[PDB]
Amino acid sequence: ASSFVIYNISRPGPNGEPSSLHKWFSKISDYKDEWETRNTLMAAALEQAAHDKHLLLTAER
Amino acid sequence: MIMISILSLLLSTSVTLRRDMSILFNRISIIALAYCILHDTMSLSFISKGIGLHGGLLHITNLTQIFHIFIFIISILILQLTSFYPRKVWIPEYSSLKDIFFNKILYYRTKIINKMGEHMKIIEYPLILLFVISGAVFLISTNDLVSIFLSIELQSYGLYLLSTIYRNSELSTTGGLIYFLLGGLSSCFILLGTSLLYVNSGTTSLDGLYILNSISDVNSWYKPYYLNFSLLIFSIGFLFKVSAAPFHFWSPDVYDAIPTIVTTFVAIIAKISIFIFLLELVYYTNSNANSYLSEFSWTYALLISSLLSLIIGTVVGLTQFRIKRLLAYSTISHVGFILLALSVSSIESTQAFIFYLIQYSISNLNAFFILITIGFSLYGYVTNNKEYKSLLDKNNSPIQLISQLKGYFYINPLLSLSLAITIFSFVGVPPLVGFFAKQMVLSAALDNGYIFLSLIAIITSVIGAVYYLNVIKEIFFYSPEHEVNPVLNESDSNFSLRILNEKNVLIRSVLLKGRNIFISSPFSITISIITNVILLFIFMNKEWLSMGTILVQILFSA
Amino acid sequence: GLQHYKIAMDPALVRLGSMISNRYKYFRWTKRTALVSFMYVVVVPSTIGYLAYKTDGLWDLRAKRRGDLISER
Amino acid sequence: YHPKDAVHLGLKGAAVVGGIGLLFAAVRTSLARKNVGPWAIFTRNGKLAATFAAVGGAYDFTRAAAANLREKEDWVNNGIGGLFAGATMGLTTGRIPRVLGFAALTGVVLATAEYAGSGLRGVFKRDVDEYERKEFLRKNRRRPIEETLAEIGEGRGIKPPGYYERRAQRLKEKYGVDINPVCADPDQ
Amino acid sequence: PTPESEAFLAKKPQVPPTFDGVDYEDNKRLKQAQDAIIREQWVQVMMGRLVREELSKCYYREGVNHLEKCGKLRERYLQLLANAKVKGYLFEQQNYWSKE
Amino acid sequence: VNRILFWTGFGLAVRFWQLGIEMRPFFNRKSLWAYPLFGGVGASFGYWLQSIDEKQTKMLEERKQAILEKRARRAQRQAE
Amino acid sequence: MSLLYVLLIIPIIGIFLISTIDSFYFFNVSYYKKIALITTILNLIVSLIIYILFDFSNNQFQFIQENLDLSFYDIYLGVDGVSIYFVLLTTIIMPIALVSNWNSITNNIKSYLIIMLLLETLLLAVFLVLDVLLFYIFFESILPPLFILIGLFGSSNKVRASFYIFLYTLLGSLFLLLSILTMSSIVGTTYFDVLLKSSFEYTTQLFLFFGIFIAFAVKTPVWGLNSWLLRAHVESPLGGSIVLAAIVLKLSLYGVFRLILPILPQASLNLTYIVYAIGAITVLYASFSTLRTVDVKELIAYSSVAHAAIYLMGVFSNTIQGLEGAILLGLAHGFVSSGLFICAGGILYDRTGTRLIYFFRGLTQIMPLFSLFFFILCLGNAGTPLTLNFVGEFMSLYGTLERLPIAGMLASTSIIFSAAYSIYMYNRIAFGGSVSLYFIDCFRDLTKREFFILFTLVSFTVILGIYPSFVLDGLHYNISSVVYGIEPNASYLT
Numbered sequence A: 001a002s003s004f005v006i007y008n009i010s011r012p013g014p015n016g017e018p019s020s021l022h023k024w025f026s027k028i029s030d031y032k033d034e035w036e037t038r039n040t041l042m043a044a045a046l047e048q049a050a051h052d053k054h055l056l057l058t059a060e061r
Numbered sequence B: 001m002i003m004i005s006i007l008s009l010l011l012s013t014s015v016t017l018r019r020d021m022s023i024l025f026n027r028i029s030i031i032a033l034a035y036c037i038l039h040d041t042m043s044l045s046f047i048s049k050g051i052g053l054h055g056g057l058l059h060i061t062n063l064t065q066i067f068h069i070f071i072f073i074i075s076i077l078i079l080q081l082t083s084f085y086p087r088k089v090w091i092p093e094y095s096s097l098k099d100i101f102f103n104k105i106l107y108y109r110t111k112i113i114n115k116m117g118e119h120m121k122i123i124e125y126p127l128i129l130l131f132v133i134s135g136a137v138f139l140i141s142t143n144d145l146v147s148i149f150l151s152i153e154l155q156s157y158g159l160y161l162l163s164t165i166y167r168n169s170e171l172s173t174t175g176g177l178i179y180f181l182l183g184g185l186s187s188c189f190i191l192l193g194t195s196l197l198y199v200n201s202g203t204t205s206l207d208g209l210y211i212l213n214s215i216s217d218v219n220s221w222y223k224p225y226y227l228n229f230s231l232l233i234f235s236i237g238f239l240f241k242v243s244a245a246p247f248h249f250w251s252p253d254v255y256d257a258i259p260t261i262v263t264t265f266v267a268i269i270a271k272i273s274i275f276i277f278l279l280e281l282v283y284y285t286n287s288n289a290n291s292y293l294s295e296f297s298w299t300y301a302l303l304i305s306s307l308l309s310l311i312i313g314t315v316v317g318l319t320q321f322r323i324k325r326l327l328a329y330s331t332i333s334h335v336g337f338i339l340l341a342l343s344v345s346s347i348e349s350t351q352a353f354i355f356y357l358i359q360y361s362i363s364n365l366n367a368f369f370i371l372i373t374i375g376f377s378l379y380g381y382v383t384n385n386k387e388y389k390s391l392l393d394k395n396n397s398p399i400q401l402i403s404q405l406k407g408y409f410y411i412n413p414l415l416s417l418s419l420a421i422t423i424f425s426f427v428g429v430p431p432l433v434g435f436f437a438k439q440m441v442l443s444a445a446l447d448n449g450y451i452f453l454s455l456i457a458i459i460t461s462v463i464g465a466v467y468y469l470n471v472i473k474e475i476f477f478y479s480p481e482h483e484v485n486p487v488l489n490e491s492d493s494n495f496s497l498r499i500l501n502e503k504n505v506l507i508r509s510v511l512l513k514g515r516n517i518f519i520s521s522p523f524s525i526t527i528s529i530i531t532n533v534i535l536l537f538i539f540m541n542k543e544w545l546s547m548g549t550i551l552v553q554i555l556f557s558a
Numbered sequence C: 001g002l003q004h005y006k007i008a009m010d011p012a013l014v015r016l017g018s019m020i021s022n023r024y025k026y027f028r029w030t031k032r033t034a035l036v037s038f039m040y041v042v043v044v045p046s047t048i049g050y051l052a053y054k055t056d057g058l059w060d061l062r063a064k065r066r067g068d069l070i071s072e073r
Numbered sequence D: 001y002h003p004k005d006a007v008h009l010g011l012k013g014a015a016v017v018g019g020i021g022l023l024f025a026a027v028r029t030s031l032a033r034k035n036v037g038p039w040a041i042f043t044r045n046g047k048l049a050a051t052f053a054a055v056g057g058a059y060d061f062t063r064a065a066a067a068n069l070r071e072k073e074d075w076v077n078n079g080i081g082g083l084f085a086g087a088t089m090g091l092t093t094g095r096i097p098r099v100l101g102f103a104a105l106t107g108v109v110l111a112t113a114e115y116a117g118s119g120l121r122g123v124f125k126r127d128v129d130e131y132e133r134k135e136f137l138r139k140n141r142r143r144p145i146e147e148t149l150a151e152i153g154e155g156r157g158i159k160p161p162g163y164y165e166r167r168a169q170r171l172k173e174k175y176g177v178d179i180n181p182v183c184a185d186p187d188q
Numbered sequence E: 001p002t003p004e005s006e007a008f009l010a011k012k013p014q015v016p017p018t019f020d021g022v023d024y025e026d027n028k029r030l031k032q033a034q035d036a037i038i039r040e041q042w043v044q045v046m047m048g049r050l051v052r053e054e055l056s057k058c059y060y061r062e063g064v065n066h067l068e069k070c071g072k073l074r075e076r077y078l079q080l081l082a083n084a085k086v087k088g089y090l091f092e093q094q095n096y097w098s099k100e
Numbered sequence F: 001v002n003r004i005l006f007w008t009g010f011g012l013a014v015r016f017w018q019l020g021i022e023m024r025p026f027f028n029r030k031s032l033w034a035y036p037l038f039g040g041v042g043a044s045f046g047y048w049l050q051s052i053d054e055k056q057t058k059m060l061e062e063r064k065q066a067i068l069e070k071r072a073r074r075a076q077r078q079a080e
Numbered sequence G: 001m002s003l004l005y006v007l008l009i010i011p012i013i014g015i016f017l018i019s020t021i022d023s024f025y026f027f028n029v030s031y032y033k034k035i036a037l038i039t040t041i042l043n044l045i046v047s048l049i050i051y052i053l054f055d056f057s058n059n060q061f062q063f064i065q066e067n068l069d070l071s072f073y074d075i076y077l078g079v080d081g082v083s084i085y086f087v088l089l090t091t092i093i094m095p096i097a098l099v100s101n102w103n104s105i106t107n108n109i110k111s112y113l114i115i116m117l118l119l120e121t122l123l124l125a126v127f128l129v130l131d132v133l134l135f136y137i138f139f140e141s142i143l144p145p146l147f148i149l150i151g152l153f154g155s156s157n158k159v160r161a162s163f164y165i166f167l168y169t170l171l172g173s174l175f176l177l178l179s180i181l182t183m184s185s186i187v188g189t190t191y192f193d194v195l196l197k198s199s200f201e202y203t204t205q206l207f208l209f210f211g212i213f214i215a216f217a218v219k220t221p222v223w224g225l226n227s228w229l230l231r232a233h234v235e236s237p238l239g240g241s242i243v244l245a246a247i248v249l250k251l252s253l254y255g256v257f258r259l260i261l262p263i264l265p266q267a268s269l270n271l272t273y274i275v276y277a278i279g280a281i282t283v284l285y286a287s288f289s290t291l292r293t294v295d296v297k298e299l300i301a302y303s304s305v306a307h308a309a310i311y312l313m314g315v316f317s318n319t320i321q322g323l324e325g326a327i328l329l330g331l332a333h334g335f336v337s338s339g340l341f342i343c344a345g346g347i348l349y350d351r352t353g354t355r356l357i358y359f360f361r362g363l364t365q366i367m368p369l370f371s372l373f374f375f376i377l378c379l380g381n382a383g384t385p386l387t388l389n390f391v392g393e394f395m396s397l398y399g400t401l402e403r404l405p406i407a408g409m410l411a412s413t414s415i416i417f418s419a420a421y422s423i424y425m426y427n428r429i430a431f432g433g434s435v436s437l438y439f440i441d442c443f444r445d446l447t448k449r450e451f452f453i454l455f456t457l458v459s460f461t462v463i464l465g466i467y468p469s470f471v472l473d474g475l476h477y478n479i480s481s482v483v484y485g486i487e488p489n490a491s492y493l494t
Ligand SMILES: CCCCCCCCCCCCO[C@@H]1O[C@H](CO)[C@@H](O[C@H]2O[C@H](CO)[C@@H](O)[C@H](O)[C@H]2O)[C@H](O)[C@H]1O
Pocket: B044, B045, B046, B047, B062, B540, B543, B544, B546, B547, B550, F052, F055, F056
């Protein structure tokens, strides 16, 4: 009975128009680009350190 | 400062014959070594491959002063073993600042703390360690053949005297005799090596020999075959003194025979100084042009010793039942790893060598400290095992068998887990520090083409992990044959402690049982700090590894 | 650990289960055990591996219709 | 290449290894706890030295013999010599499983050392810029298509543009049938 | 046609499905090229999914004579079946094909 | 992580491990002052590692600049 | 801080509370066991929060934290669809693993709870780390707690069982370390974003493959190298058995999606026939010798070897279906193997003190609730439809057939042989005659504890079998990134 009730409530509607909870859920987990901006910075640094590790470890004796 | 401390301690020790004064001579030795740390700490304000001092017979390098500090700290940690009584009495009523600093406790401390134990009655014991330390910090700073020979003997002769200092022990006198006799034959090889250098070069200075080797390295009546031959004999003497296979048979016997307090120092300090001196010699004796001089490199003996040390150290250790023989063989397989990074002379290998050496000296110290503390904890325990009544020198080495650690998990869980954390570091299990050390020495060898040796190291690391796990199986997989002494808790057996304020007025009187006796804080805190360093290294690694990256950058620089 | 219920442990089955557990301690290298070991560990895997190599990428069925051939190679 | 006198080299291998074992037999005589005398090196410890010459001689002779047959010099020959050397070690103990087992261990290690490169001596130096070599490897992100198709080959889901026309040519050559799939639409 | 959904603006690729002229050390441009190629391969396979749904309704509508009424849909599905697989970007990223 | 926090907790963890080895009661009130003391010593060792790190960063940065001038001066002299 | 670091601290916080509660009261062991169980539930609530927020079609790692401070070794946490379900499986099992073994420990209970709370952190980390040396660090940090879990709370042959797991896993994993060190030397870092851009030369790839596969073959495990599992799983306590099969055997499965599929593609392609030849052999031999095993708990362990081989051939298919089926069969194995271990190690051994199938017969007559669940978990082991185990096997087997048809044809024989041993074990314990005569006294049926963990594990297996899209929608886009190949008209677009 609960599953039938819960599923009926959580449906979007006739044509789009999501419910208030749907609006809330999509809003909190937006992260429009903040995973990309943080991954790109970290990839850039760890790429620099690889160049540095190669420069210090392969130096003329 | 080490020389001002030796002569001052010597003069005070010369005019006394009181054996109760030993406790305070070891305490002043700790304070004296702290001033040496503060002086060498100020001697790090320059970037230099090296500066020749006192007529060119000595040198200072950032690596020399860094490792003078390390030697003094390792000595300070070992000196505590004779600066503080093994056990203490602690009550919640005497635990505050007002109590520890302004109040006082009165009780019969003699049998509880072992006031008159053998270790607490050698007046010249703090003095002779200082003599060994002096020869160690001279080896690191030697720029001449003569200074090398005089420094190595200063260190060797004091190690022999340490091994023989328990004169009433028929095990210690034998071990020192074995050590002096096999150590003297080693000294002949070091002296033959330097003699053959001077007769073919006319020089005693390392830098002149370095420049003679430098000019010879170009891809007629005087071909320099002598340098790689002389250094080869010169390497045999130092290979013996670090107990690298095949010149290793003495260490299991000597480390097992002398007292455990002594083997902590004997089995650590000598390898610290010998391995540093070899590194600079390996660097400036390198070949930059593959010629016939490079085909006879003396560094091959270190590559064969490393291969032999990896195999012998892990294979022979499988059937050891005596704990100090086991730890002796475990050190042999660890110098096979140290010797492999020395033989590959690369920026990465030199950084791996500096880390392996420091982290292992610190970790093998924890293993000795835990062993000494476990023996001092069985004071409130009784055993009926027949194999323990037949043991010898039970005061010099209270723990001699791995059978004696059966069920220690039940007796002391965190002391057992500390020894577990240390032992798993010797195996190389992540996230423990000993893993990162072997990681750096496997990556250095692999990147330089020592793939065959790297495969042999990881195979013996499995073999050597077998006898490490056997010690763990004993401590945690079985119940203890050691049981609490029945008399120490009889409900009628209590010792009266008195609490006194500043002017000797009885604040309180307490009734105490054997349950109010614990380990002294100097040994519990020291064990706690090193176990944490082995465990939390992956959160505190930047400045330790950065120091080594900088030290190697100066050595290889230009 | 926890007390279990009472089982009529058959001495014959208990010693049989003990036998199965310690059996490896008595394996020897005979002409027979080598023959079975060589067949199972070498011959069968080498035969399966050989066919795996010979027929690898040999056939594809997707979208193949009449007038096309299943054989890729 | 230059052929090697296998028999001449074989004696050198037997003498060098058998000389060392003769030195090992001598330690046994020196350490003997009874008055065995000087001639105990060739009577009681003679087998120890003899098997050293046998093992060393077979290794170098079979290594040289292997090189002549294959007309090449590489790590493979260190495998044939090691297998025959280990086989000789197993012959002394008289146990079949070990004749094969000792040959296995010896052959694998003596070939693994050579294929890796001689670690026990000075490793070969390329004499190049290490920074350039390492950096090229890290930044060689894309490669010519021809380079990869050489190691893996087209097929197994690697259908490079033009795979179908080539497959038609390949299938026509081998099967002698022209590929012409059916329409599936009755109209057009 | 059908309006482009709001959810179909956030995930719409802003770059062409290619690796040519893409600096790899610019991680931002590189990951979007990876995303652009994967999204195209997926649109192609869902294009065949939708044609297959229409084929089924033509099959259950025409019954016996589907063999002469559903041929256009059969063509399109068989075209897509031979051409759309999700093969990834890894080969595409690691090789360049000159097209000459 | 923050060095001051890691070292402050390192000193806290050393006090906890000490009493566990001695099998003494963690949290006796008349001896609670040891936790601020051990942690305070931990905080101090950390301001020092912060000074060590600051100087190591400067000198490792310089070295990477030196290896780049050497590789460049050598490259320039090879253009002839 | 990030939300992926909260996953790690909570089990550490629980370790601290178990260690300090005696210092505030002589405290009961029931209080230690509620702390450990509440701590594992909170980790499961966080992990469900992470899954609600997770983006199912994103190519960037999510829930990361801007380090901005670089050291020699630094922890970098992130989540992708390839790893989210492995995290969820770890967080659903660990609570049941504790509840299953709630009464059976009796001695050293704090130590037991601390090891499991420590294992949960180490196994959670191995899925969350974004470097390959950090992967190795946690993929091998689990070996000291597991050596002591088996030695302290294991069965009779525990000492040898614990030596086998540690030494084989140590030996096998040290060939992985050599391969990882080589890649770091050539690229300068093991951070995934930088390593996945890099393309190795074929010869380097073919030697990096030899060393990652040697590690994985020991840890899968394959047939001639599976001796450690036949000892480890059986002599382990019930709780350790649940972790080792459900979570530790999956570390090698998830390690191919990181260490092999994206960075050694040409080597994986040209060597698949070696993998498939081994995988085929370990499907047959393991299954033939699972038919003749007389220890029930070792019959469940042998079954795991046959299933791991199906998912290993699935990860080497270069197909989208066999790759997702491999992850589904690893998730499915996590629930079903947990239930069968609970039945053998936690219900029969609890009541009889024996594991020999000689002594069990007709158990359905006196224990009808046990036989119902036991039947359902035996059917899932047999890959019956309506269970998640069928979906994973079908997709794993199809990609195997599409890659190299012949080996998938032998591997398909698992449908006849998994069925053979599963029903044969069932008919000999639940059925097979009347209640045995070796049972002197009657045995009670399932407890409300035994019932509800078996019911929970069966519920996950069946519901996910009906609607596998709960897991399939998350993996699609991320699986799409590990495929190697082109199509002649879909590639190189202008
Ligand atoms: C885990 C244990 C705790 C961390 C262990 C390491 C901490 C100490 C590392 C010190 C070494 C590196 O840190 C740095 O190195 C250089 C090396 O010459 C030295 O630096 C010294 O010479 C330079 C150059 O003239 C001066 O600028 C500097 O002021 C002076 O101190 C010091 O030693 C230290 O400033």
